[PDB]
Amino acid sequence: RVTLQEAPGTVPPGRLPRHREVILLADLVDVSKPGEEVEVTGIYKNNYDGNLNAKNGFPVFATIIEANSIKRREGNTANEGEEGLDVFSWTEEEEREFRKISRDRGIIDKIISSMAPSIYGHRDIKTAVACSLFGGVPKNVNGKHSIRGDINVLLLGDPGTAKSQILKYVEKTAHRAVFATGQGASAVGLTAS
Amino acid sequence: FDILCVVRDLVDEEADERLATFVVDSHVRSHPENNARQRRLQRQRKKEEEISPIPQELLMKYIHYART
Amino acid sequence: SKFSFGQATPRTLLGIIRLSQALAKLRLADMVDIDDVEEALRLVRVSKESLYQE
Amino acid sequence: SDEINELKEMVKDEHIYDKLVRSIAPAVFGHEAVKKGILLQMLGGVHKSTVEGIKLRGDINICVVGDPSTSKSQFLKYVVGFAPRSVYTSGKASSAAGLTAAVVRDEEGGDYTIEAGALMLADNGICCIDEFDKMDISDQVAIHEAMEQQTISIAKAGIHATLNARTSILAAANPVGGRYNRKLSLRGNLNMTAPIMSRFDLFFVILDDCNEKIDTELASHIVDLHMKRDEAIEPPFSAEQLRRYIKYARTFKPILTKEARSYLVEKYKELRKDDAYRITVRQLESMIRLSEAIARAN
Amino acid sequence: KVITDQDLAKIREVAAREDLYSLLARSIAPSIYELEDVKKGILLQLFGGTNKTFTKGGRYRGDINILLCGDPSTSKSQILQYVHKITPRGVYTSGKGSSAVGLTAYITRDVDTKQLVLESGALVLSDGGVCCIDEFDKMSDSTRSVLHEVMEQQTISIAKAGIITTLNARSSILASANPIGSRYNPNLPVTENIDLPPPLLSRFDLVYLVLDKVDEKNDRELAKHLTNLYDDVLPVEFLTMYISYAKEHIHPIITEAAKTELVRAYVGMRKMGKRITATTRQLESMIRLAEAHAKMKLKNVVELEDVQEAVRLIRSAIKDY
DNA sequence: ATCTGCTTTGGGTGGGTGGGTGGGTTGAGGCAATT
DNA sequence: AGCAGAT
Numbered sequence: 001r002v003t004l005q006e007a008p009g010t011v012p013p014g015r016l017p018r019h020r021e022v023i024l025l026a027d028l029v030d031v032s033k034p035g036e037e038v039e040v041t042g043i044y045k046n047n048y049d050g051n052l053n054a055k056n057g058f059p060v061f062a063t064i065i066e067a068n069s070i071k072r073r074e075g076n077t078a079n080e081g082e083e084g085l086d087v088f089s090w091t092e093e094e095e096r097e098f099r100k101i102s103r104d105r106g107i108i109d110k111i112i113s114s115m116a117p118s119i120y121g122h123r124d125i126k127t128a129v130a131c132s133l134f135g136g137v138p139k140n141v142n143g144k145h146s147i148r149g150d151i152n153v154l155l156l157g158d159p160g161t162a163k164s165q166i167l168k169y170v171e172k173t174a175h176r177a178v179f180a181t182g183q184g185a186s187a188v189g190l191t192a193s
Numbered sequence: 194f195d196i197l198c199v200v201r202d203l204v205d206e207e208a209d210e211r212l213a214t215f216v217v218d219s220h221v222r223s224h225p226e227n228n229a230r231q232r233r234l235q236r237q238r239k240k241e242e243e244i245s246p247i248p249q250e251l252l253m254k255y256i257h258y259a260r261t
Numbered sequence: 262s263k264f265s266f267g268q269a270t271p272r273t274l275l276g277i278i279r280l281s282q283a284l285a286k287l288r289l290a291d292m293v294d295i296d297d298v299e300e301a302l303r304l305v306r307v308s309k310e311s312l313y314q315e
Numbered sequence: 316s317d318e319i320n321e322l323k324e325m326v327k328d329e330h331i332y333d334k335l336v337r338s339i340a341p342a343v344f345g346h347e348a349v350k351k352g353i354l355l356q357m358l359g360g361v362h363k364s365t366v367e368g369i370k371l372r373g374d375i376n377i378c379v380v381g382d383p384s385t386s387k388s389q390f391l392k393y394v395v396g397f398a399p400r401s402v403y404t405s406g407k408a409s410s411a412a413g414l415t416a417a418v419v420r421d422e423e424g425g426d427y428t429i430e431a432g433a434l435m436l437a438d439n440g441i442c443c444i445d446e447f448d449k450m451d452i453s454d455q456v457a458i459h460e461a462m463e464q465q466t467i468s469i470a471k472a473g474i475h476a477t478l479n480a481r482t483s484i485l486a487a488a489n490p491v492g493g494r495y496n497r498k499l500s501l502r503g504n505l506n507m508t509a510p511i512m513s514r515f516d517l518f519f520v521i522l523d524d525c526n527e528k529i530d531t532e533l534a535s536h537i538v539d540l541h542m543k544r545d546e547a548i549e550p551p552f553s554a555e556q557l558r559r560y561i562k563y564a565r566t567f568k569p570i571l572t573k574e575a576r577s578y579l580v581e582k583y584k585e586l587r588k589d590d591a592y593r594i595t596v597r598q599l600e601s602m603i604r605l606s607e608a609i610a611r612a613n
Numbered sequence: 614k615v616i617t618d619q620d621l622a623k624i625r626e627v628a629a630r631e632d633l634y635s636l637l638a639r640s641i642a643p644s645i646y647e648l649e650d651v652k653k654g655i656l657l658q659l660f661g662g663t664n665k666t667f668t669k670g671g672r673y674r675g676d677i678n679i680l681l682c683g684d685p686s687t688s689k690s691q692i693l694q695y696v697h698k699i700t701p702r703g704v705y706t707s708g709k710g711s712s713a714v715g716l717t718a719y720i721t722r723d724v725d726t727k728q729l730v731l732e733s734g735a736l737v738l739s740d741g742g743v744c745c746i747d748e749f750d751k752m753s754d755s756t757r758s759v760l761h762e763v764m765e766q767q768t769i770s771i772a773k774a775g776i777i778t779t780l781n782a783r784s785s786i787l788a789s790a791n792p793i794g795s796r797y798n799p800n801l802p803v804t805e806n807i808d809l810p811p812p813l814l815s816r817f818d819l820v821y822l823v824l825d826k827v828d829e830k831n832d833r834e835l836a837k838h839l840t841n842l843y844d845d846v847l848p849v850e851f852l853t854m855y856i857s858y859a860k861e862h863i864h865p866i867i868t869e870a871a872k873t874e875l876v877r878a879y880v881g882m883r884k885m886g887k888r889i890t891a892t893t894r895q896l897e898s899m900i901r902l903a904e905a906h907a908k909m910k911l912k913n914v915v916e917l918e919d920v921q922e923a924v925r926l927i928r929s930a931i932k933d934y
Numbered sequence: 935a936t937c938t939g940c941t942t943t944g945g946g947t948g949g950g951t952g953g954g955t956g957g958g959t960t961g962a963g964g965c966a967a968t969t
Numbered sequence: 970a971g972c973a974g975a976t
């Protein structure tokens with residue numbers, strides 16, 4: 001069982017959020033995790049609750065949702081124009097062609113071009129972003145030595161130089177992304193609390 | 194930080210010329226006014242092809258496949 | 262100068278008359294003698310100046 | 316039917332653009348330069364999103380600077396009482412949220428909850444800040460993303476979210492010194508920094524003159540406001556008329572013609588050349604926004 | 614538990630009195646000594662200027678805000694207590710004072726019923742009255758923000774705990790202030806001594822500098838008055854009923870002669886100065902004070918005398934302040 | 935009219951798919967906002 | 970043990 005709550009983005013500003021309870025039966029358990037947006041398809045059902053009647057004074061029933069599918073809406077506000085419960089998954093025909101696109105000789109540079117095409121220049125920034133998106137390979141040497149396998153990028157530029165737009169694009173494109181701003185983040189907001 | 198990218202804004206008339214042209218063309222392209230679902234998808238594809246050699250959705254799936 | 266605790270105010274007058282009234286109460290006399298007022302004045306003076314001047 | 320006829324009669328007028336500017340905040344006297352900015356802010360600009368989900372701003376931010384007692388607040392008061400959605404606040408906001416959102420948790424177990432601020436409450440409206448130059452450092456920094464990306468990102472203990480802040484800011488500020496000094500530049504007279512200053516589309520400076528003629532004229536008008544009451548104010552278009560036309564204008568989504576496209580590039584070139592640091596790539600989009608707003612007014 | 618035709622006739626009889634002004638001024642606070650100007654200003658504040666409901670224009674406040682600032686020796690809390698007693702509606706508060714109810718509307722939980730209730734603060738409960746704030750110097754910055762919002766917009770807006778509401782706070786303010794040190798230094802300006810933002814002390818219609826300069830004659834007179842405490846005057850009930858009647862029924866209006874005198878006085882007060890002697894705020898203060906003076910006479914019109922009295926008080930207030 | 939059967943106080947020898955607007959209330963420790 | 974129900 002999970003307690004669904006209205007997303008802060010949709011709730012009217014300043015008002016309290018409503019919530020409902022969703023029941024996830026086998027094969028749907030652990031698909032959703034705390035702190036994540038989701039799109040739940042299910043059956044709206046009601047049953048008798050004695051305590052609710054006792055507190056309210058009227059014969060009001062209790063309502064729940066019986067989940068039938070879940071779609072992870074977190075960090076995908078710009079992918080709402082897409083079918084399926086997963087927008088980063090592939091058919092058997094889409095990966096028989098991700099393998100033609102990739103034998104061609106200049107994919108390493110048509111990929112860099114396709115990074116935030118609505119930004120005019122900044123080839124180095126786009127190359128760094130592509131490298132970070134694809135990332136390196138982690139390796140545990142003999143089970144004793146751990147070596148990081150991901151690439152970190154820093155953009156240190158002038159005011160109107162299309163940095164935040166690049167960050168927003170990377171948020172759109174990555175499988176799992178979270179956006180944080182300077183003073184809107186805390187030491188335990190990042191990491192764990 | 195593996196990569197440091199320093200960005201500078203310098204006034205070069207030729208550089209300002211290209212950037213302004215691109216920005217104005219982009220604003221024109223993104224204007225809202227500029228089967229039904231099939232026609233909408235086709236026009237969106239035509240608009241997207243002008244600036245990106247690879248479709249963005251195909252690119253997302255490709256990146257996920259490569260990382261997996 | 263900076264040595265003074267604080268310039269006298271009407272509060273000081275009210276305090277002086279209050280002390281004189283209490284002294285008269287101790288004396289058990291209605292009529293507040295000049296002696297009570299003088300003693301109250303001496304008390305206020307020695308409250309602070311007596312030890313500050315040392 | 317009758318109102319439509321009124322609307323048609325309004326558009327057919329050839330002075331229409333001038334009449335609307337002269338009909339904004341009739342209470343104030345002789346600040347037509349400011350009024351043009353406010354009218355353009357109400358109409359706004361076209362909001363666009365690219366073919367890859369990158370959002371381009373379409374809201375006009377205005378800053379007003381002037382000496383004390385120069386009808387600065389009178390302009391904000393008119394906007395909040397006229398615009399559909401709006402929120403009047405001050406830089407030194409009393410609430411914990413301030414201009415942006417804050418996280419507040421009820422006693423003991425209760426998990427953290429988001430408390431809306433000024434910029435969130437004015438969503439899709441106009442947020443009027445009475446004293447911009449006195450904002451708190453947390454809001455000063457947090458206002459960076461709200462003004463351009465139109466969101467507020469918060470990641471605190473147990474709660475993380477992106478909150479919509481699609482608002483147009485109309486701020487009023489006092490000079491760093493007691494009065495605006497004509498010798499220094501706008502940068503010197505203001506305590507704001509370059510990144511914020513580039514986020515404002517327009518700037519208006521209101522001075523205080525000691526001319527006898529202007530003093531008598533201003534004093535007369537203020538007194539007549541109380542004496543004649545309504546009779547002292549006769550703008551061409553009443554408040555109901557103006558609010559109807561503005562709603563009609565916003566249904567228009569003007570585009571850029573071929574001739575204007577080339578022309579708009581040349582003007583940015585000239586603006587950049589004279590600068591060489593006020594002007595950035597943002598000013599190019601400001602001219603696109605204002606051009607759309609001016610078109611909407613017509 | 615432990616108005617009539619006759620009252621109206623008595624009110625007209627007192628109104629017709631030639632020496633009405635000084636009579637009310639003396640009757641406001643009999644026990645205070647030799648503060649005629651302050652009492653006159655407070656009397657004007659009590660009546661309050663006309664309130665304007667405007668179409669095609671914003672609302673114009675008829676309240677009067679007065680700041681009674683000076684040395685601690687003088688009598689300032691006395692005057693606030695008197696005003697509280699006289700006022701038909703109002704509250705008494707001290708900044709940063711837990712005893713006071715609170716200046717701003719705040720959401721709380723009813724202990725008796727365990728429910729959430731929106732409780733209005735002192736400013737909202739003073740709607741239509743005078744809110745006397747005894748200690749204006751020591752105030753929380755948030756309190757000074759809500760005060761700015763009140764004196765500017767005359768409403769308090771609270772948007773917390775799921776509630777978004779606005780409360781009318783059309784209340785005058787009569788605050789008191791003390792110097793940073795043990796006494797007021799004439800050499801330094803009023804702003805430095807007061808320890809208040811220029812944006813805040815610029816909003817008071819009158820600012821009164823009551824200083825305890827040491828003078829043989831003045832101290833002699835004050836001591837004589839105080840010791841003796843161990844020209845008719847009016848009972849407090851009559852004063853409050855008169856004030857309520859005037860504040861509810863009379864609504865003075867400006868005239869062409871008053872319009873000429875106001876313009877001329879404002880221009881003269883500007884031309885005195887480059888240093889800016891007066892601002893457009895002084896014009897609103899003068900018109901409000903003239904309206905209040907007209908109200909006190911129960912007149913429905915503002916004559917040359919009302920505007921002239923208002924300028925004399927405003928000019929004197931600009932004077933030592 | 936007689937026989938059969940459940941549940942208290944309040945408390946962990948009912949619990950957390952009953953909650954805290956059904957009462958059991960100090961003590962410690964973590965977090966944001968205030969400084 | 971007092972009260973709530975079925976034969």
Ligand SMILES: Nc1ncnc2c1ncn2[C@@H]1O[C@H](COP(=O)(O)OP(=O)(O)OP(=O)(O)O)[C@@H](O)[C@H]1O
Nearest residue numbers: 342343344345382383384385386387388389893894
């Ligand atoms: N140009 C003007 N036209 C009309 N009224 C004016 C004008 N200038 C000043 N006033 C009058 O001045 C009065 C007081 O000015 P106000 O406090 O609104 O100015 P401000 O610039 O917002 O002040 P501050 O900078 O101190 O916040 C206003 O009520 C308005 O009536």
Ligand SMILES: Nc1ncnc2c1ncn2[C@@H]1O[C@H](COP(=O)(O)OP(=O)(O)OP(=O)(O)O)[C@@H](O)[C@H]1O
Nearest residue numbers: 271272275645646684685686687688689690691791
């Ligand atoms: N006419 C007067 N002129 C000067 N002082 C007076 C007068 N009448 C009374 N006082 C003195 O003022 C005292 C009351 O004023 P109060 O003590 O409230 O002073 P304050 O300046 O308002 O504030 P503070 O509490 O900081 O002294 C009376 O106890 C008396 O001492």
Ligand SMILES: Nc1ncnc2c1ncn2[C@@H]1O[C@H](COP(=O)(O)OP(=O)(O)O)[C@@H](O)[C@H]1O
Nearest residue numbers: 118119120121159160161162163164165463596
């Ligand atoms: N090279 C560029 N190509 C296209 N647009 C640009 C470029 N540089 C700046 N912009 C414009 O600037 C705006 C974004 O500025 P932003 O990156 O948010 O400023 P900051 O770098 O301070 O975050 C966008 O509207 C974008 O169109």
Ligand SMILES: [Mg+2]
Nearest residue numbers: 163164165459
């Ligand atoms: Mg940025």
Ligand SMILES: [Mg+2]
Nearest residue numbers: 386387388389
């Ligand atoms: Mg102002």
Ligand SMILES: [Mg+2]
Nearest residue numbers: 685689690691
């Ligand atoms: Mg006092």
